[PDB]
Design a protein around this ligand. Structure first.
Ligand code: HEM
Ligand code: HEM
Ligand code: HEM
Ligand code: HEM
Lengths: 146, 142, 142, 146
């Protein structure tokens, strides 16, 4: 992607106003409830019994926060995303066996949770830049052919 | 397929947010056209497809009225949405890949407008419902 | 959804190619594992998942027996494949995104083995049928 | 994608043994029948009334042949695919309004038609290299974010 200055500014603004401790746990818990098959990568997280358990699970929260901080390296260098996530890609694939389709599901949950937080400030243009950035990260993680 | 639990969740959510159907539609169509530019071609016969357009606002009412119809026909989406399927397939020739894009935009809009009501449990049932709506709209395609 | 025309096309095709179900399965599973490496993890408990493996061959018989069951339950795939859905969702925990991958591999194998029978008209109905099988296998997932 | 020498050899072998006049019309006619909504880009092609008409349509044949020859430039320079298809991408998008999802549907029909022709020679490894090459072309044409 050839980023416009406006896209860079939007992405920078979004991440600098995001409360990772709030957004991260919400995004991952939402993904585990809306696409429950993803719970299989979190066996030893404890209480994953129902929505209430998942939403309050501190292990799920810790991991959702890690996911958001994992996006920081992409934000820091938007022109080198595929290379930056190469090791994370190998980890989730070879070691963790996460299905490449799961990155897209989680990224839609991050977008939906951010939309709920931002409310009317999550304009179409904001949504377009944010989803475009997540699409690039998802491609690198899932090792899509391009 | 939608379970009784899913149908009850969708009916309860719609009961809460239905009063804002028109606004949700205007917002969902507006985002779709901006974020997924390939969808703009289907609305190009309108004299104004730019942000804030009165045609997009008017159409948004119709789109969410179709969602309201789907909620009323939730027990049999194929029969309930058959005429809308024929219209999108034959009269408008809308590529069926676009139904899931508008669905995602509707979920985004509902999240921005009703953060408290749109819980992960409301979202799982609504998402299954919207996939069902897309499959029913795809009925007359092939 | 499957029309009477689609059901008749699938039954007629299966009538012609069913004698080779075992071979089709071995071939479809073998390609899936090689072309979509992410699927190999689900079969890793087997002592041999390499090309030509006797476990893949044996399993291929079971997979196409599931397709044969789906052809017999074509009028109601959800009820007919409910136990298989529960098994893939709960016991095996197979990610549902993989059903469409195996479906594509089955279409490729049928094309290599029955080029004359697998016409564009047989393909459209079989493809709609396989999407229905995937949706029915996804029943117990969420 | 970082092509292996084996992938390059497979792709070269496939294209050098392909009869474009046979495979091209079959792939496009199959796409128009299996995913009939794609027929909307071929209004003035004449007889598109039913499967028989489509399969025998010489305009559909001419276009299917063009599609296959359109893949030649990719085969010629496998390390510069995204750049090579940039103009074709703009044509199908801006001028033709072809939905980006349609390239994937057509590429699966090309794979299925090639499988029917090659029969047992269309091994898993052959299928993997061919689909990987088509995936890269489809990404460039559909302007996927990466
Ligand atoms: C936008 C997508 C994602 C990003 C940026 C991301 C980021 C990360 C990061 C930064 C870590 C920590 C790495 C380490 O500990 O060395 C991690 C680990 C892990 N991720 Fe992800 N991840 C993503 C998506 C997923 C998805 C979809 C799943 C599963 C469905 C998943 C499952 C895991 C698991 C199980 C761990 C291992 C850590 C442990 O179990 O304690 N991740 N991920
Ligand atoms: C959630 C899915 C959708 C619903 C429930 C829906 C519903 C509707 C309804 C109720 C109408 C009015 C029909 C009439 O004229 O009586 C309509 C028309 C139309 N829809 Fe959709 N629709 C959906 C998705 C789409 C998508 C994805 C596109 C295109 C990208 C689309 C493009 C159109 C167009 C072009 C019209 C006609 C506009 C005009 O009157 O000029 N629809 N739709
Ligand atoms: C066309 C779709 C499919 C059909 C009809 C199908 C059918 C079957 C059948 C009949 C069984 C045997 C069940 C039993 O134990 O009684 C089975 C087991 C299994 N299937 Fe599937 N399946 C499909 C797709 C998949 C996919 C996409 C994967 C994974 C990528 C998968 C992985 C498995 C595994 C891991 C087993 C158990 C193997 C064992 O016995 O150790 N299946 N399937
Ligand atoms: C692997 C994918 C494809 C490749 C490599 C490809 C290649 C080409 C080439 C080389 C041309 C001729 C360009 C010219 O005349 O300057 C063309 C034109 C065109 N293509 Fe494609 N194409 C592909 C997919 C599609 C798809 C999926 C559609 C529609 C669903 C499509 C619709 C058209 C149309 C309508 C024309 C304009 C030519 C005319 O109408 O006479 N193409 N394509």
């Amino acid at each position: 992607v050839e980023w416009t200055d406006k896209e860079r500014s939007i992405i920078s603004d979004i991440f600098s106003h995001m409360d990772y401790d709030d957004i991260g746990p919400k995004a991952l818990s939402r993904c585990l409830i809306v696409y429950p098959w993803t719970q299989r990568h979190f066996s030893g997280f404890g209480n994953l019994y129902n929505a209430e358990a998942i939403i309050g699970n501190a292990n799920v929260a810790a991991h959702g926060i890690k996911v958001l901080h994992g996006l920081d390296r992409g934000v820091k260098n938007m022109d080198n995303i595929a290379a930056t996530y190469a090791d994370l890609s190998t980890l989730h694939s070879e070691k963790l066996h996460v299905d490449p389709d799961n990155f897209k599901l989680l990224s839609d949950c991050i977008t939906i949770v951010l939309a709920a937080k931002m409310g009317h400030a999550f304009t179409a243009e904001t949504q377009g830049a944010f989803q475009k950035f997540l699409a690039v990260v998802v491609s690198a993680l899932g090792k899509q052919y391009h | 397929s939608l379970s009784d639990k899913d149908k009850a969740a969708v009916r309860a959510l719609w009961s809460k947010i239905g009063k804002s159907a028109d606004a949700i539609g205007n917002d969902a169509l507006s985002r779709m056209i901006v974020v997924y530019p390939q969808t703009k071609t289907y609305f190009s016969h309108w004299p104004d497809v730019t942000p804030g357009s009165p045609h997009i606002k008017a159409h948004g009412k119709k789109v969410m009225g179709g969602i309201a119809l789907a909620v009323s026909k939730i027990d049999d989406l194929k029969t309930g949405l058959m005429e809308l399927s024929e219209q999108h397939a034959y009269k408008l020739r809308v590529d069926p890949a676009n139904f899931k894009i508008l669905n995602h935009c509707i979920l985004v809009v509902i999240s921005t407008m009703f953060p408290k009501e749109f819980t992960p449990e409301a979202h799982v049932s609504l998402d299954k419902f919207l996939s069902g709506v897309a499959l029913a709209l795809a009925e007359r395609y092939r």
